[PDB]
Structures are given as C-alpha cells and as structure tokens.
Amino acid sequence: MTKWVLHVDLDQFLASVELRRRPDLRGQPVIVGGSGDPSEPRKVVTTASYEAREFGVHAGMPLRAAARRCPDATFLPSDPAAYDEASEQVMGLLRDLGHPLEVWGWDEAYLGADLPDESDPVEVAERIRTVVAAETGLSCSVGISDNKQRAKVATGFAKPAGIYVLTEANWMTVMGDRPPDALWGVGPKTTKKLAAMGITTVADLAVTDPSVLTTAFGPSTGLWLLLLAKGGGDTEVSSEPWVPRSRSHVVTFPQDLTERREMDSAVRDLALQTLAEIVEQGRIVTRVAVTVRTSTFYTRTKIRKLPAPSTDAGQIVDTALAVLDQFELDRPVRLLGVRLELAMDDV
DNA sequence: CCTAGGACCC
DNA sequence: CTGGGGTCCTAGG
Ligand SMILES: Nc1ccn([C@H]2C[C@H](O)[C@@H](COP(=O)(O)NP(=O)(O)OP(=O)(O)O)O2)c(=O)n1
Ligand SMILES: [Mg+2]
Ligand SMILES: [Mg+2]
C-alpha cells in the first residue's frame, strides 16, 4: 500500500459557479463582485476568471480599477447563497468517495488515500476531477503528496484544470530556488526577517542551523519552518467536523458616518445580526470585539470578555456599545465591525 | 488571566 | 483610492 494526501481546490470558484448559469461566457473575462456595477465606489473584485487575471485583475482590486484594466469584462454581482450551496454540493460528493476528507474553508479539501499497487494517485485524482465536473458543472485541480502542506504547494502547479505530484523525489529540485513565501504559512514579513538572516530561498532555509531559527522564531516555530522547507507537514487527514471559533460582520458605508447616533445604531445592528446567526447554529458567545476604521483608513479593534458565556441580546449589545464607546470617534467613520468569539468546550 | 495586534490565509 | 470573513500566536499589562 502507498499512503497519499490529495488536496482538491475549485478553479476560479465564484466565476465557475456563475458560468454554469452563463455558459456563453466560458472563455471570456468575467469579474464577480459588488452588485455587478463596475463604477460603484467602495467595492472590489471577489473573483476574476482566469481570462481577466491575464489583464492583471485579482481578488481585492477595486472594481473601477478592474474595469480600467479589463475593458472587455462582464461584471456579475456576488450571489453568496449560490456559492454556499455549490460549496456544500462539492464537499458532499467528495465525502462520498469513502476516503477521510478534511474540508478547509469554502472551496478546498484534503483527502487521505492508501492505494494498492494496481492503482496510481494520478488516476484517482483524475476520477475526482471527472466526478466533480459531471455532477456539479465545476472544475477543480488536485495536488498530490504525502503531507497536507506539500499537497497544497502541489495544487498551485496543478492549476488550472489539472493534477500535479510533488514528493521527496522532486521537492527540492522544484522548490529550492523559490522564495520562502512559497511555503504555506510563510508570508512577506517572515520572508523579510529571513532575508536579514541571509536566507532568501527554500533551499537556504532547509539547511539553516536550527539554533539560528529557534532563537529568532521560538523553539517550536523555528523547527516548524525547517520542516516546511524540507517539504514536510501534517500527515493526518481528519474527518472531524470543523467548529468555528468566531463569527463576524463588517460594513464599509457608502458614505462616512459623522453622527454618533448612526455609529451606535450600526454596531447594535451588527451585534444583533451576528448573535442571531450564532444562536441558530447552537453556539454561545465568550467575547465581543468591535472594529473601527476612520476616513483616513486608520483601523483598530478592541475586545471585551463577557463575565460568563451568554447569548443574551441586551448584554451583548450593551457590551458592543461600551466597547465602541472606548474609541475616540473624532474622525469620520468608514467602517464598523463586530466579531463574536464563541465557546469551544461542550457544543 | 486579560487585551492588543501582527501575520497570514480564503 | 483602498471588501468581507476567518485562524493562530505573541507581546506585555
Ligand atoms: N482575497 C480573497 C481571496 C478569495 N476569496 C473568495 C473568492 C474565491 O473564488 C474563493 C476561493 O479562494 P481561492 O481558492 O484562493 N481562489 P479561486 O478559487 O478564485 O481561484 P483558483 O483557486 O483557481 O486560483 O474565496 C475572497 O473573497 N477574497
Ligand atoms: Mg480555488
Ligand atoms: Mg482555495
């Protein structure tokens, strides 16, 4: 038997869901985000189709910028319920292959497989791609390795509509001259810190003296960085259901708020909304966090623990408005948010 | 034991 | 000009 980890990731997810209702747009630039109006201020791209990506459009880009770069794009509004339904379909199908399946957010999953000699993980990945497309109308790509971190890196090579195997046989030859942010969990700030140590590539990091890393990053994290660079990772695929730690809602206002009354009212509303959604899922609140962003884009969050976990609406609102009260509120307000941290122990 | 917030990801 | 929704860990009262 040979043990594999497969990492499945939906291609251009939100665009691919829209394309199933608009098959005439396959092969054309499609941009999903806001209300489908590319001139609307304070709205951004949530997904650009691969064709729009060749024009430099990417998630986060303001729609008016996207329209400037990609004049021949069809702009569609965001349809969150269709996306949540398509997510559910795909994972339902993936679970029914009879392998341990670990869903990771919305559009991806890790699958564990122990394969007899007669089979090949590439042909299994093929079948996954086939079943998802036949039953859902959606394309996925599949990375293959022997650990989750490496399989995820493989997926980035597998894109679009494809499959890629990355193992001890080829890890360092493919990855060795890549910057450390090619690794999963490393980003630009860790990369900058590494560079000031003389480490500029995956290969450099993989042969770094462990005591250089543990002094700079801590005794666990430094060893973990060395492991990631060597292409190692997590090997167990858990089917245990994911328990969310928190839920949040923010809103960027079409115009900046200048009246306290309105700020209070928005926070009250966001608390109430978030609370009802966590109650409907059976959850209890532990902490209440409020975020404020000024017209200058100066952004801060403050948090306060309840005296005991609760779902009491008046308590939770009073706490959010007391947290909001801590902010200066001297400048116009562009954004307000509430996050509810959730009890993890019993349910 | 608590909050602030950096860093990284979809 | 610059969206929305998350997780984890550390720095420091
Ligand atoms: N900055 C971001 C990144 C992702 N997302 C949403 C929309 C994406 O289609 C979806 C999935 O993330 P993704 O898998 O990183 N990318 P996407 O599926 O569009 O493309 P590929 O995975 O084919 O490259 O999360 C977002 O709303 N804001
Ligand atoms: Mg994807
Ligand atoms: Mg993804």
Description:
Among the domains are: 14-80, MutS, DNA mismatch repair protein, domain I (3-Layer(aba) Sandwich); 170-230, 5' to 3' exonuclease, C-terminal subdomain (DNA polymerase, domain 1); 246-342, Dna Ligase, domain 1 (2-Layer Sandwich), CATH 3.30.1490. The strands form 3 sheets. It has a 5-stranded mixed sheet. The two termini are 38 Å apart. The relative contact order is 0.10. It is 39% helix and 24% strand. The chain is α+β, with helices and mostly antiparallel strands and 347 residues long. The structure holds a DNA duplex (10 and 13 nucleotides). Monomer.
Give the biggest sheet.
5 strands, mixed
Q: Tell me, briefly, the overall form.
A: globular
Q: What name does CATH use for the topology of the domain at 246-342?
A: Dna Ligase, domain 1
- Give the strand order, joined by hyphens, for the main sheet: 5-6-1-7-8
- The rounded distance between the terminal residues' Cα atoms is 38 Å
Residue fraction in strands? 15-25%
Q: Which structural class is indicated by helix and strand composition?
A: alpha+beta
Count of strand segments: 12
